[PDB]
Paper text:
[name],2-dioxygenase from Pseudomonas putida strain NCIB 9816-4 (NDO) is one of the most well studied Rieske dioxygenases; it is an α3β3 hexamer and is the first Rieske nonheme iron oxygenase for which the three-dimensional structure was determined. The α subunit of NDO contains a Rieske [2Fe–2S] center that accepts electrons from the ferredoxin component, which originate from an NAD(P)H on a reductase component, and transfers them to a nonheme mononuclear iron at the active site. The catalytic domain of the terminal oxygenase is the well described 2-His/carboxylate center composed of a mononuclear iron coordinated by two histidines and one aspartic acid inside a large hydrophobic active site. NDO has a relaxed substrate specificity and catalyzes the dioxygenation of many two-ring and three-ring aromatic compounds to their respective cis-dihydrodiols.
In order to study inhibition of the activity of NDO by inhibitory compounds, we also complexed NDO with the known inhibitors indole-3-acetate and benzamide and determined the structures of these complexes. The structure of NDO in complex with benzamide was determined to 1.65 Å resolution. Benzamide does bind in one orientation in the active site of NDO. It was hypothesized that this compound should bind tightly with the heteroatoms near the mononuclear iron because the aromatic ring could be positioned between Val209 and Leu307. In addition, the amide group would be able to interact with charged residues on the wall of the active site, while forming hydrogen bonds to the water/hydroxide bound to the mononuclear iron. The N atom of the substrate forms a hydrogen bond to the water/hydroxide that is bound to the mononuclear iron. The O atom of the inhibitor interacts with the side-chain N atom of Asn201, which is 3.6 Å away, and the side-chain N atom of Asn297, which is 4.0 Å away. There are no examples of NDO catalyzing the oxidation of compounds containing an amide group and it is unlikely, based on structural evidence, that NDO would be able to catalyze the oxidation of substrates with amide groups that are free to interact with the mononuclear iron very efficiently.
Residue numbers in the entry:
A (entry chain B), B (entry chain B), C (entry chain B): 2 to 193
D (entry chain A), E (entry chain A), F (entry chain A): 1 to 446
Amino acid sequence: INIQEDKLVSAHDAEEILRFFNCHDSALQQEATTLLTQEAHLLDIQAYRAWLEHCVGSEVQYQVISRELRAASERRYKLNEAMNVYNENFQQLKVRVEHQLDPQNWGNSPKLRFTRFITNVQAAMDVNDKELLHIRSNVILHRARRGNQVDVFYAAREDKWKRGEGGVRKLVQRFVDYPERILQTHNLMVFL
Amino acid sequence: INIQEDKLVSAHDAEEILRFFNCHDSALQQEATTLLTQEAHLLDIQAYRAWLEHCVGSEVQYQVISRELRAASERRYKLNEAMNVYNENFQQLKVRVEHQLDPQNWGNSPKLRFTRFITNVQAAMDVNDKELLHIRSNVILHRARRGNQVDVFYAAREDKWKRGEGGVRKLVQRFVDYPERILQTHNLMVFL
Amino acid sequence: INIQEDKLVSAHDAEEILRFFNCHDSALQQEATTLLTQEAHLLDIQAYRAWLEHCVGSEVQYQVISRELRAASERRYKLNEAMNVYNENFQQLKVRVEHQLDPQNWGNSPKLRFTRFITNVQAAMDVNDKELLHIRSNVILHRARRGNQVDVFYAAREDKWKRGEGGVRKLVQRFVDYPERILQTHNLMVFL
Amino acid sequence: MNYNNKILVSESGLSQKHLIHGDEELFQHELKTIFARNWLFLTHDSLIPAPGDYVTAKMGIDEVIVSRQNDGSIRAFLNVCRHRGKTLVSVEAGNAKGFVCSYHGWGFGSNGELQSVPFEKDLYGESLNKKCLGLKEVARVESFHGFIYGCFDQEAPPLMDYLGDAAWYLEPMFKHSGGLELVGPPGKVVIKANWKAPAENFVGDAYHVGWTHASSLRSGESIFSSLAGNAALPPEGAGLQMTSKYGSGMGVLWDGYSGVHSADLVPELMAFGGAKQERLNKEIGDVRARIYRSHLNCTVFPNNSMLTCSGVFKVWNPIDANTTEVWTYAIVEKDMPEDLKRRLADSVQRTFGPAGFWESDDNDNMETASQNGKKYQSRDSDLLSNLGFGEDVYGDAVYPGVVGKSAIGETSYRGFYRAYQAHVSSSNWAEFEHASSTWHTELTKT
Amino acid sequence: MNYNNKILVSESGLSQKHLIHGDEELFQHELKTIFARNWLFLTHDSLIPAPGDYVTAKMGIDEVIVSRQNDGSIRAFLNVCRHRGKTLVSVEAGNAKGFVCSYHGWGFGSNGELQSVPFEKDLYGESLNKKCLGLKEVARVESFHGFIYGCFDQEAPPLMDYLGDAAWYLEPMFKHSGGLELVGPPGKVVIKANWKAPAENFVGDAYHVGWTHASSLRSGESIFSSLAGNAALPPEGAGLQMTSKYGSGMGVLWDGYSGVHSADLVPELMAFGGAKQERLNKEIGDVRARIYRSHLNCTVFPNNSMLTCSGVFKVWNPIDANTTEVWTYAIVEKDMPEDLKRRLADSVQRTFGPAGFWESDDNDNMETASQNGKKYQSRDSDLLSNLGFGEDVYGDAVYPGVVGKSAIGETSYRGFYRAYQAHVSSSNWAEFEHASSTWHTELTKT
Amino acid sequence: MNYNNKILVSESGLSQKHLIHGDEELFQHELKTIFARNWLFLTHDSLIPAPGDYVTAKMGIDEVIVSRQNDGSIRAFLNVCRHRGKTLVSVEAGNAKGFVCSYHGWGFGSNGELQSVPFEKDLYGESLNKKCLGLKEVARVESFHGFIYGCFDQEAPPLMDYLGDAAWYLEPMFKHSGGLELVGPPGKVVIKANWKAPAENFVGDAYHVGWTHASSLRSGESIFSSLAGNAALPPEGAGLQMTSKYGSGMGVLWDGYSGVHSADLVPELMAFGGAKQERLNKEIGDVRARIYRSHLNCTVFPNNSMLTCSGVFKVWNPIDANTTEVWTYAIVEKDMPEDLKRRLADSVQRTFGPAGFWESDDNDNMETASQNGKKYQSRDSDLLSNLGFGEDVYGDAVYPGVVGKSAIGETSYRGFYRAYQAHVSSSNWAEFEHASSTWHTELTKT
Ligand SMILES: NC(=O)c1ccccc1
Ligand SMILES: NC(=O)c1ccccc1
Ligand SMILES: NC(=O)c1ccccc1
Ligand code: FES
Ligand code: FES
Ligand code: FES
Ligand SMILES: [Fe+3]
Ligand SMILES: [Fe+3]
Ligand SMILES: [Fe+3]
């Protein structure tokens, strides 16, 4: 993509396109689909320890940002463009997992209900790190609790996955640029 | 999964994980995807007789439950945990199908519009019944009617499918534990 | 399908079923899935010129209709049944693309955020035009802008795709019968 | 609007202003004059049978905790902490000796008492008067054969008297059958209708059944099925209608024991009810034993409805003028075989639950009738309930109450709305009584 | 708020309080003084041409059924059953001899009469006075060259007189062109704006076009395209503005017959309109024949707007102070070739329909201006409409009405809001007339 | 409701009517007597440091543009065009010399002046008085060590005086530390609570920490962690509470410089704060240097809250009685190493941001307490804030304000609500002052 012609396209987005439009490996797309479906299943049943053990690499960065709304024509104002809703290493994910599992987490009684819908899976091996897999996917996440609270989240995820212990593919980076600037879901206390 | 460690995980959910994490057959996942996509297509165009004929086995149990909200730490109160929104055999499904098709079903004029989104498909053959296929999938169901009524349903489905007449795979069990306790969709008069 | 028995089914819908239930080619379903996922990616990052160049055939008809609500038993009233929300040839799509990219399109600042979820993909070659591919798919489209505006669109798409310049498969027809009669999304200014 | 003067319901209950289904100021007024004043359904003994068992329930828009005490009584309390007002209990049912607030940890007993305050000695010393900080208690809690009702107004009539002439009709099934059980948990669905729309429908509307439920009657094969599409009018004396001083009323359809249940349950039910009727003839007499196995469509004023024999039990919980949260339980006879109870409960939900195909037939009727009450040209228009007027009687030798001796009519609408208007225009129970001293005379005019 | 005294619109219509776009109490007051009093667009002959044809339409927040009678007349009725108030018709258009309610099956004729009641003899006997139970009828229904309007107030001026001086400008296209057809069905979209925001924009706002629609002007290549980004001010005498006693007004852009249509339709339209103009010179004179092929942006007070030549026809249906349901039809000249009619209809929706790229340019303007009327610091602030004030005339020898002889100004805003304020502060038509006896003098001051 | 007479807060601030968290009429009254009258947080110098830099901010329900002027001052203006009221700026931050309206293209300077009008000469001639058409300006804009507040009421006390006795406690961190920076952009989330629920919680609620945040205390390993599950009461003299005349107040937890930050930041922070404290002993004395590195939970009346040392900075932006838009920034000390600032900012959002695990613990508390204020049986009920009453002092030789010399109590609730009631019952600042002439005496009774 020429972003001087496609005026609305960011440099970052143009680079990610390039990654998937080149080599297509059908088998890899299917592996990626399995990986993400299994990850979503573990999260939906709130098997957060199992998720850490089976899906998340020790070197992970798990990041969800919220970008400040700026003018399309803005060129001068150069202060922090985004804040981190999540920017977690493995130990920080573990803290959040223990917080979910703590028997004095009053907000988890009665038990929450999660349903995740993963679509638009794309996968490509890294050019330089032949052991690094880039996976892109979109998620709809439905969280229901306490009779009549329903929150639905929508996001695109840019992931890197790598074989770790036992040859199991694990998440080493997730990046989400959350599309809604003001959350209307009470909080973003869900793992996208 | 060890549910003594993963405190939020139910025994039922842990067993269903185990089913899919073992043997993976890519071809089976693709067959399952076709089966469910075709089923959803028939339902979306309101071909309810065709759905019964082609998708639903004579021995079916079609069940959607609503679970009462109880304390996570509850151990003593042991009365009925759930009610059945649906718990239908084939003849009961047929009654509901005839009710939909009846020309004096005033609520079906003007014609409803359905759109179903099926994701997260997983499939595994049963260990003991080599002719029984377990399929898990998630559905978003959009129902629109009468200018400005829109209802969106979200659920995970635990299915068993088996070859019947003509070798056609048909639904012999569907189980849904509906995630919202108080429905905000006027009714649950849709086939999930 | 016998639409004299399946009373709620339209002649058009019955014909489209027939198209996909016959020959199943698994490889074709996978090609179709790739094609649509890549198209959705280009649209989500607002690469509208790239979308035209890579995804849209010169002979395209891009059509989204809204059907007037009529009685299921209606047989006499025979005036225009639907209006065209979109009914665009390639040049008309180009006009809309230039409108999106114009630096005085004030509504595009701050930049919109799009996330598309494509599901239920089915593909079949045409019987008579061995170079024409029919693809059906459903889309959820999430559009977020200006802090707290969120609009979610839901539709089924009936597409025809054909190899054009360089052997690249391109869209030559898209048809959507939009399921909500009164839009509650401010407008339908999105490419479904 | 001046509720002392505004005629919302015309004399004899013959008509009502359509605004009553849409006006939010009136809804707010009903919270005071209807829901804070009258008896409201809470739960059944079968759902809280043991000491410590509790459920949550709505009373109007308020939520209460309903708890079985150690002495076997039941007490109910606002589900609101006495400190900074947090909702105390977040679940629907359970068993506990008390409830601890998740904000600052105040602990209340199952008897509503403030029993513990974290670090009380170090923080409050001896200055906190916990004796005056018990949960706000529902003034009145009473049972009708296991069915538990609550009332916020200490001045209300006892529940038995409040049921008035309706109690006589309920007793064969609620008492003489050996007793009923409520099968939980309920289905819960929000509809965009005023609470009065389903309440009025269940209290006295048989006219709609053949037309509204045409498809369900044709498809399900139940015993009321001859009615589908208004193909057949019920025979003479197929039933009656009644109403009472405090607003409760019902229709009686003679012998219809299998109710809305599809043909798969008809022979078994008709056998069971007929067998019990035979035993009951000797104890309560032929008429009342027959009433036991006759289908009653009843509303216990204001917002609890039921279909006996069908086994449908409803609470129409008000949210706002065009929003109602519908709770649906099944009722079964305690001495039924357990497998029949299970199948009956499933069939109640199949027909009238969240995916109830019968209940779905009513949706558009209730919702549009309610929403039209907000529309400018309809607010001051008159909803009609005059069918059968001038043919009702009172003080009949066999059937008590204001009675229409016909299966189809609007007798019970008139009694429901007469009581409603008397409450809306009154400041307390004494004023309601004064406004009701000629209640049956008003209903039987002409 | 006291609507007799509150100055919501200043003298000469020069400014309005911003709260008028946000205040819900005022919205409720408008239902009475604006929508229940004035003429509202229903449908066109072309949409209900045959006996039995009907459509549903909104009149304010009320819904009506609009039906072609056997005698060729049109009658309209509230879409509400006279029994228990259910919505009678659930579709948008059809053909029928009557309408049966899905609740209890009452059957009304296309003429609104209660014609049948299920089991009437057995149930009501001879006691039901069906003669007094016809559907509530819209008091006034009249046609302007096929365009059908309704009014709930029997005391309203005839529709022709209500159009006042605006009718003269509409006639060349609506009458002398041979007649127009409305192409349905309409697009329908909800916007979060007050109904007055698009109404005022269409009645008299040319100032916004170059800036708001910069991208659409640049991208579409229509004949108004020189305006993109305020790159060029229209030449002197490129058009005029007018307004009238009862609030209707419009802008006239000379010769702009292809309107907003993209270059793909420009040559064909400019040929067609020019050819008809040539024929019309002889019959209605050069000025009026020119008006025929000139672009009119018009609002017929209160909430029906149009762009002639572009062929856009709008109804801004009110929902609440910040919600409006927009209906968009295409208008075409009956004697156009059918293929041109089809392409014109598609182009109307392409530019101004649910995915109309022009209409989308206006969204944020209408929505934020309306929503800001709820904000505390803006409620009592003044929206300005003074552009051109002091240069308007009345009684011109060639162009009737209060007229600003310039293409861009706010003349039509002033007339729209003068009529609005006169209605909001009046209890009936007589009071509006009294409040309007010096209407043109007020508008032309200074 | 008559706000002159209605006792919403009892004497000494001991209790409040629960309706204050739910009543929409009161919310509307607060827009006038609370938000249009008092000082509200806008931005920090660090977010608009250069000429032309601007941000948008809420002041109550109004939106303003806050702009750095060429002379280095800051001015703020309603984000509403002076023509037809469109929202002028649609972004959250940027740099510009002015703002052009997207409706008709009016151009306003960064100083609020109407600087350009498209085609002014040709359209308005010399008749448009642009001098009187500048954007509506926020009357008062003042800085507290870089933190910029605005007030719509010209009669307000200067910001320094408005902070009253709270300023003394803030100064060690806000001034003597070398100055703070606000790290943007903020997280933004809507919660279904009244703005007063989080405001009261931050101003004076330490009691809830051990119980509400049990899971976060146990899981995160911060220095306040001994409190988890009420396992341990803080030692004697672990802190104090204070409040002030104009409503601002805070808790002080001695030495708690690492605050809520997880163990991964504790040693580095405790080293940094201790090192600066050592330098500050010489300049501001031991007590105040200790206050610098002590955790303050503060609300600056009405709706700006903070946790110093933790670095959490909150604005509770009101939407309606049960809706609040929460903005969350991080505060850091300017002379901290940049990498520590980055990690501190991330940790603020980790704990108290949109996915803040601590902040999530509070959700149900705030939301249900607020929503219960709408429930009929709770409206007239009393929320209690009597903990510590009778032990507060005023005029202490070391710690200024009304002070409770204990770590846990409700002193600051009482001062917050005393000021709230004085404003709600007053028409202007003079009346508030009259209603507050014995403010500390009222708070220290008994
Ligand atoms: N009102 C009712 O639902 C009803 C049902 C069945 C029989 C009679 C009445
Ligand atoms: N107000 C309008 O939409 C307009 C459009 C085109 C020309 C003039 C006015
Ligand atoms: N109110 C609070 O959030 C708080 C947090 C930490 C310490 C003290 C108070
Ligand atoms: S609100 Fe319940 S203990 Fe404080
Ligand atoms: S409501 Fe229409 S027939 Fe009863
Ligand atoms: S509304 Fe801003 S220029 Fe007209
Ligand atoms: Fe019914
Ligand atoms: Fe426009
Ligand atoms: Fe907290």
